[PDB]
Coordinates of all heavy atoms in Angstrom, one line a residue:
Chain A
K69 N 23.9 15.0 3.0 CA 24.9 14.8 4.1 C 24.2 15.0 5.5 O 24.7 14.4 6.5 CB 26.0 15.8 4.0 CG 27.2 15.6 4.9 CD 28.2 16.6 4.7 CE 29.1 16.7 5.9 NZ 30.2 17.7 5.7
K95 N 22.3 3.0 6.2 CA 23.0 4.2 6.5 C 24.3 4.4 5.7 O 24.6 5.5 5.2 CB 23.3 4.3 8.0 CG 23.5 5.7 8.5 CD 23.9 5.7 10.0 CE 25.4 5.5 10.2 NZ 25.7 5.0 11.5
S109 N 36.2 17.2 -6.9 CA 37.5 16.9 -7.6 C 37.3 15.5 -8.3 O 37.9 15.3 -9.4 CB 38.7 16.9 -6.7 OG 38.4 17.9 -5.7
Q131 N 42.8 19.4 -30.4 CA 43.5 18.2 -30.0 C 44.7 17.9 -31.0 O 45.8 17.8 -30.5 CB 42.5 17.0 -30.1 CG 41.3 17.2 -29.3 CD 41.5 16.6 -27.9 OE1 41.4 15.4 -27.7 NE2 41.7 17.5 -26.9
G132 N 44.4 17.8 -32.3 CA 45.5 17.9 -33.3 C 44.9 17.9 -34.6 O 44.0 17.1 -34.9
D224 N 19.0 7.2 -28.1 CA 20.3 7.9 -28.5 C 21.5 7.2 -27.8 O 22.6 7.4 -28.3 CB 20.3 9.4 -28.3 CG 19.3 10.1 -29.2 OD1 19.3 9.9 -30.4 OD2 18.5 10.9 -28.7
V244 N 18.9 -0.3 -33.9 CA 20.1 -0.9 -34.3 C 21.3 0.1 -34.5 O 22.4 -0.3 -34.5 CB 20.0 -1.7 -35.6 CG1 18.9 -2.8 -35.4 CG2 19.7 -0.8 -36.8
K250 N 27.1 -2.0 -21.9 CA 26.8 -3.3 -21.2 C 27.6 -3.5 -20.0 O 28.9 -3.6 -20.1 CB 26.9 -4.5 -22.2 CG 26.0 -4.4 -23.4 CD 26.6 -5.0 -24.6 CE 25.6 -5.1 -25.7 NZ 26.0 -6.1 -26.8
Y312 N 32.7 -8.1 11.2 CA 31.7 -7.7 10.2 C 30.4 -8.2 10.5 O 29.4 -7.6 10.1 CB 32.2 -8.0 8.8 CG 33.0 -6.9 8.2 CD1 34.4 -7.0 8.3 CD2 32.5 -5.8 7.6 CE1 35.2 -6.0 7.7 CE2 33.2 -4.8 7.0 CZ 34.6 -4.9 7.1 OH 35.4 -3.9 6.6
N387 N 37.9 -13.8 -19.7 CA 38.0 -12.6 -20.4 C 37.0 -11.5 -19.9 O 37.4 -10.5 -19.4 CB 37.9 -12.8 -21.9 CG 38.5 -11.6 -22.7 OD1 39.3 -10.9 -22.2 ND2 38.0 -11.5 -23.9
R388 N 35.7 -11.8 -20.1 CA 34.7 -10.9 -19.7 C 33.9 -11.3 -18.5 O 32.8 -10.8 -18.3 CB 33.7 -10.7 -20.9 CG 34.4 -10.1 -22.1 CD 33.4 -10.0 -23.3 NE 33.0 -11.4 -23.8 CZ 33.8 -12.0 -24.7 NH1 34.9 -11.5 -25.1 NH2 33.4 -13.2 -25.1
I416 N 42.7 -4.3 -10.6 CA 43.6 -4.8 -9.5 C 43.6 -3.8 -8.4 O 44.0 -2.7 -8.6 CB 45.0 -5.1 -10.0 CG1 45.0 -6.1 -11.1 CG2 45.9 -5.5 -8.9 CD1 45.2 -5.6 -12.5
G420 N 40.9 -3.6 0.3 CA 40.0 -2.9 1.2 C 39.3 -1.9 0.4 O 38.6 -1.0 0.9
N423 N 35.0 -1.9 -3.4 CA 33.8 -1.2 -3.7 C 34.1 0.2 -4.3 O 33.2 0.8 -4.8 CB 33.0 -1.1 -2.5 CG 33.6 -0.3 -1.4 OD1 34.8 -0.5 -1.1 ND2 32.9 0.6 -0.8
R426 N 38.1 3.7 -8.0 CA 38.9 4.9 -7.9 C 38.9 5.7 -9.1 O 38.8 5.2 -10.2 CB 40.3 4.6 -7.5 CG 40.4 4.1 -6.0 CD 41.9 4.2 -5.6 NE 42.2 5.5 -5.2 CZ 42.9 5.8 -4.1 NH1 43.3 4.9 -3.3 NH2 43.1 7.1 -3.8
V427 N 39.0 7.0 -8.9 CA 39.0 8.0 -10.1 C 40.2 7.6 -11.0 O 41.2 7.1 -10.5 CB 39.0 9.4 -9.6 CG1 39.0 10.4 -10.7 CG2 37.9 9.7 -8.6
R435 N 35.8 3.0 -20.2 CA 35.7 4.3 -19.6 C 34.3 4.8 -20.0 O 34.1 5.2 -21.2 CB 36.8 5.2 -20.1 CG 38.0 5.1 -19.2 CD 39.2 5.8 -19.7 NE 40.2 5.9 -18.7 CZ 41.5 6.3 -18.9 NH1 41.8 6.7 -20.2 NH2 42.3 6.4 -17.9
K442 N 29.3 12.3 -27.8 CA 29.5 12.4 -29.3 C 30.7 13.3 -29.5 O 30.6 14.5 -29.2 CB 28.2 12.9 -30.0 CG 28.0 12.4 -31.4 CD 27.0 13.3 -32.1 CE 25.7 13.3 -31.3 NZ 24.7 14.2 -31.9
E447 N 37.4 20.1 -38.5 CA 38.8 19.8 -39.0 C 39.2 21.1 -39.7 O 38.5 21.8 -40.4 CB 38.7 18.7 -40.0 CG 37.9 17.5 -39.5 CD 38.1 16.2 -40.2 OE1 38.8 16.2 -41.3 OE2 37.7 15.2 -39.6
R448 N 40.5 21.4 -39.6 CA 41.0 22.7 -40.0 C 41.5 22.6 -41.5 O 41.7 21.5 -42.0 CB 42.2 23.2 -39.1 CG 43.1 22.1 -38.6 CD 44.2 22.9 -37.8 NE 44.0 22.8 -36.4 CZ 44.3 23.7 -35.5 NH1 44.8 24.9 -36.0 NH2 44.1 23.5 -34.2
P449 N 41.6 23.7 -42.2 CA 41.5 23.7 -43.7 C 42.8 23.1 -44.3 O 43.7 22.6 -43.6 CB 41.4 25.2 -44.0 CG 42.1 25.9 -43.0 CD 41.9 25.1 -41.7
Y452 N 46.5 24.1 -43.5 CA 47.1 23.5 -42.4 C 47.6 22.1 -42.8 O 46.8 21.2 -42.9 CB 46.2 23.5 -41.2 CG 46.9 23.5 -39.9 CD1 47.2 24.7 -39.2 CD2 47.2 22.3 -39.2 CE1 47.9 24.7 -38.0 CE2 47.9 22.3 -38.0 CZ 48.2 23.5 -37.4 OH 48.8 23.4 -36.2
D456 N 53.5 15.0 -41.6 CA 54.3 14.1 -42.4 C 54.6 14.6 -43.8 O 55.6 14.2 -44.4 CB 53.6 12.7 -42.5 CG 53.5 12.1 -41.2 OD1 54.6 12.0 -40.5 OD2 52.4 11.6 -40.9
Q463 N 44.0 18.6 -53.4 CA 43.8 17.3 -54.1 C 43.5 17.5 -55.5 O 43.9 16.7 -56.4 CB 42.8 16.5 -53.4 CG 42.9 16.5 -51.9 CD 42.0 15.5 -51.2 OE1 42.1 14.3 -51.6 NE2 41.3 15.9 -50.2
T464 N 42.7 18.6 -55.9 CA 42.4 18.8 -57.3 C 43.6 19.2 -58.1 O 43.9 18.7 -59.2 CB 41.3 19.9 -57.4 OG1 40.2 19.5 -56.6 CG2 40.9 20.1 -58.8
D470 N 48.9 15.1 -61.7 CA 49.2 13.7 -61.6 C 50.5 13.6 -60.6 O 51.5 13.0 -61.0 CB 49.5 13.0 -62.9 CG 49.3 11.5 -62.8 OD1 49.6 11.0 -61.7 OD2 49.0 10.9 -63.8
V476 N 54.2 11.2 -50.7 CA 54.1 10.1 -49.7 C 55.4 9.9 -48.9 O 56.5 9.7 -49.6 CB 53.7 8.8 -50.4 CG1 53.7 7.7 -49.4 CG2 52.3 9.0 -50.9
Chain C
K69 N 54.1 2.0 -52.2 CA 54.4 3.3 -52.8 C 55.1 3.0 -54.2 O 55.0 3.9 -55.1 CB 55.4 4.1 -52.0 CG 55.6 5.5 -52.4 CD 56.7 6.2 -51.5 CE 57.3 7.4 -52.2 NZ 58.2 8.1 -51.3
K95 N 44.1 4.1 -59.4 CA 45.5 4.6 -59.0 C 45.4 5.4 -57.7 O 46.2 5.3 -56.9 CB 46.1 5.3 -60.1 CG 47.6 5.4 -60.1 CD 48.2 6.2 -61.2 CE 48.1 7.7 -60.9 NZ 48.3 8.5 -62.1
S109 N 53.5 9.7 -38.2 CA 53.0 10.7 -37.2 C 51.5 10.6 -37.2 O 50.9 10.8 -36.1 CB 53.5 12.1 -37.6 OG 54.7 12.0 -38.2
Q131 N 47.2 7.8 -14.6 CA 46.2 8.8 -15.0 C 45.8 9.6 -13.9 O 45.9 10.8 -13.9 CB 45.0 8.1 -15.7 CG 45.5 7.2 -16.9 CD 45.4 7.9 -18.2 OE1 44.4 8.2 -18.8 NE2 46.6 8.3 -18.7
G132 N 45.2 9.0 -12.9 CA 44.9 9.6 -11.6 C 44.4 8.6 -10.6 O 43.5 7.8 -11.0
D224 N 34.9 -10.9 -29.5 CA 35.4 -10.0 -28.4 C 35.2 -8.5 -28.8 O 35.2 -7.7 -27.9 CB 36.9 -10.3 -28.1 CG 37.1 -11.6 -27.5 OD1 36.5 -12.0 -26.5 OD2 38.0 -12.3 -28.0
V244 N 25.7 -11.3 -26.9 CA 25.1 -10.1 -26.3 C 26.1 -9.4 -25.4 O 25.8 -8.2 -25.0 CB 23.9 -10.5 -25.5 CG1 22.9 -11.3 -26.4 CG2 24.2 -11.4 -24.3
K250 N 29.3 0.6 -34.8 CA 28.4 0.7 -35.9 C 28.7 1.9 -36.7 O 28.7 3.1 -36.2 CB 27.0 0.8 -35.4 CG 26.5 -0.5 -34.7 CD 25.5 -0.2 -33.6 CE 24.9 -1.4 -33.0 NZ 23.7 -1.1 -32.3
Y312 N 36.6 17.7 -63.4 CA 36.6 16.3 -62.8 C 36.1 15.3 -63.7 O 36.4 14.1 -63.5 CB 35.8 16.3 -61.5 CG 36.6 16.7 -60.3 CD1 36.7 18.0 -59.8 CD2 37.3 15.8 -59.6 CE1 37.5 18.4 -58.8 CE2 38.1 16.1 -58.5 CZ 38.2 17.4 -58.1 OH 39.0 17.7 -57.0
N387 N 20.1 13.7 -36.5 CA 21.0 13.4 -35.4 C 22.1 12.4 -35.8 O 23.3 12.6 -35.8 CB 20.3 12.8 -34.2 CG 21.1 12.8 -32.9 OD1 22.1 13.6 -32.8 ND2 20.7 12.0 -32.0
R388 N 21.7 11.2 -36.3 CA 22.6 10.1 -36.6 C 22.6 9.9 -38.2 O 23.1 8.8 -38.6 CB 22.2 8.8 -35.9 CG 22.4 8.9 -34.4 CD 21.9 7.6 -33.8 NE 20.5 7.4 -33.9 CZ 19.6 7.9 -33.1 NH1 20.0 8.7 -32.1 NH2 18.3 7.7 -33.3
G420 N 37.3 20.7 -49.4 CA 38.2 20.1 -50.3 C 38.8 18.9 -49.5 O 39.8 18.3 -49.9
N423 N 37.0 13.8 -47.8 CA 37.5 12.4 -47.8 C 38.6 12.2 -46.8 O 38.8 11.0 -46.4 CB 38.0 12.0 -49.2 CG 39.2 12.8 -49.6 OD1 39.2 14.0 -49.5 ND2 40.2 12.1 -50.1
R426 N 40.7 13.9 -40.9 CA 41.9 14.4 -40.3 C 42.2 13.8 -39.0 O 41.3 13.5 -38.2 CB 41.9 16.0 -40.3 CG 42.0 16.6 -41.6 CD 42.4 18.1 -41.4 NE 43.8 18.2 -41.2 CZ 44.6 19.1 -41.8 NH1 44.0 20.0 -42.7 NH2 45.9 19.2 -41.6
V427 N 43.5 13.7 -38.7 CA 44.0 13.2 -37.4 C 43.4 14.1 -36.3 O 43.2 15.2 -36.5 CB 45.5 13.1 -37.4 CG1 46.0 12.5 -36.0 CG2 46.0 12.3 -38.5
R435 N 35.3 8.1 -31.3 CA 36.7 7.8 -31.5 C 36.9 6.3 -31.5 O 36.8 5.7 -30.4 CB 37.5 8.5 -30.4 CG 37.8 10.0 -30.8 CD 38.3 10.7 -29.6 NE 38.9 12.0 -30.1 CZ 39.3 13.0 -29.3 NH1 39.2 12.8 -28.0 NH2 39.8 14.1 -29.8
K442 N 40.5 -2.4 -24.2 CA 40.0 -2.7 -22.9 C 40.9 -1.9 -21.9 O 42.1 -2.1 -21.8 CB 40.1 -4.2 -22.6 CG 39.2 -4.7 -21.6 CD 39.6 -6.1 -21.1 CE 39.8 -7.0 -22.3 NZ 40.3 -8.4 -21.8
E447 N 44.3 0.1 -9.4 CA 44.0 1.1 -8.5 C 45.0 1.1 -7.3 O 45.3 0.0 -6.8 CB 42.6 1.0 -8.0 CG 41.6 0.7 -9.2 CD 40.2 1.0 -8.9 OE1 39.8 1.2 -7.7 OE2 39.4 1.0 -9.8
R448 N 45.4 2.3 -6.9 CA 46.4 2.3 -5.8 C 45.8 2.3 -4.4 O 44.6 2.6 -4.3 CB 47.3 3.5 -6.0 CG 46.7 4.8 -6.5 CD 47.7 5.9 -6.5 NE 48.1 6.2 -7.9 CZ 49.4 6.6 -8.2 NH1 50.3 6.7 -7.3 NH2 49.7 6.9 -9.5
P449 N 46.6 1.9 -3.4 CA 46.0 1.4 -2.2 C 45.3 2.5 -1.4 O 45.2 3.6 -1.7 CB 47.2 0.8 -1.5 CG 48.3 1.7 -1.9 CD 48.1 2.1 -3.3
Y452 N 46.9 5.9 -0.3 CA 46.8 7.0 -1.2 C 45.4 7.6 -1.2 O 44.5 7.0 -1.7 CB 47.2 6.5 -2.6 CG 47.7 7.6 -3.5 CD1 49.1 7.9 -3.6 CD2 46.9 8.4 -4.3 CE1 49.6 8.9 -4.4 CE2 47.4 9.3 -5.2 CZ 48.7 9.6 -5.2 OH 49.2 10.6 -6.0
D456 N 39.8 14.9 -2.2 CA 38.7 15.6 -1.5 C 38.7 15.3 0.0 O 38.1 16.1 0.7 CB 37.3 15.3 -2.1 CG 37.2 15.7 -3.5 OD1 37.5 16.9 -3.8 OD2 36.8 14.9 -4.4
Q463 N 37.9 1.6 5.6 CA 36.5 1.5 5.7 C 36.0 0.7 6.9 O 35.0 1.0 7.5 CB 35.9 1.0 4.4 CG 36.5 1.5 3.2 CD 35.7 1.2 1.9 OE1 34.5 1.3 1.9 NE2 36.4 0.7 0.9
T464 N 36.8 -0.3 7.2 CA 36.5 -1.1 8.4 C 36.7 -0.3 9.7 O 35.8 -0.4 10.6 CB 37.4 -2.4 8.4 OG1 37.2 -3.1 7.2 CG2 37.0 -3.3 9.6
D470 N 32.0 4.2 13.6 CA 30.8 4.9 13.1 C 31.1 6.3 12.7 O 30.5 7.3 13.2 CB 29.6 4.8 14.1 CG 28.3 5.0 13.5 OD1 28.2 5.7 12.5 OD2 27.3 4.5 14.1
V476 N 32.9 13.5 4.7 CA 32.3 13.9 3.4 C 32.5 15.4 3.2 O 32.1 16.2 4.1 CB 30.8 13.6 3.4 CG1 30.1 14.2 2.2 CG2 30.6 12.1 3.5

Side-chain angles (χ1 to χ4, degrees):
Chain A
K69 191 183 160 176
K95 204 182 82 197
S109 330
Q131 304 269 284
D224 292 309
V244 305
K250 295 147 173 200
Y312 271 93
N387 197 21
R388 294 178 291 277
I416 297 107
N423 63 312
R426 287 199 81 136
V427 181
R435 277 169 165 170
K442 208 196 303 177
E447 318 197 345
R448 37 176 104 215
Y452 205 90
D456 296 309
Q463 317 192 47
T464 306
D470 201 331
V476 172
Chain C
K69 191 183 160 176
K95 204 182 82 197
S109 329
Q131 304 269 284
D224 292 309
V244 305
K250 296 147 173 200
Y312 271 93
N387 197 21
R388 294 178 291 277
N423 64 312
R426 287 199 81 136
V427 181
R435 277 169 165 170
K442 208 196 303 177
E447 318 197 345
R448 37 176 104 215
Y452 205 90
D456 296 309
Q463 317 192 48
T464 306
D470 201 331
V476 172

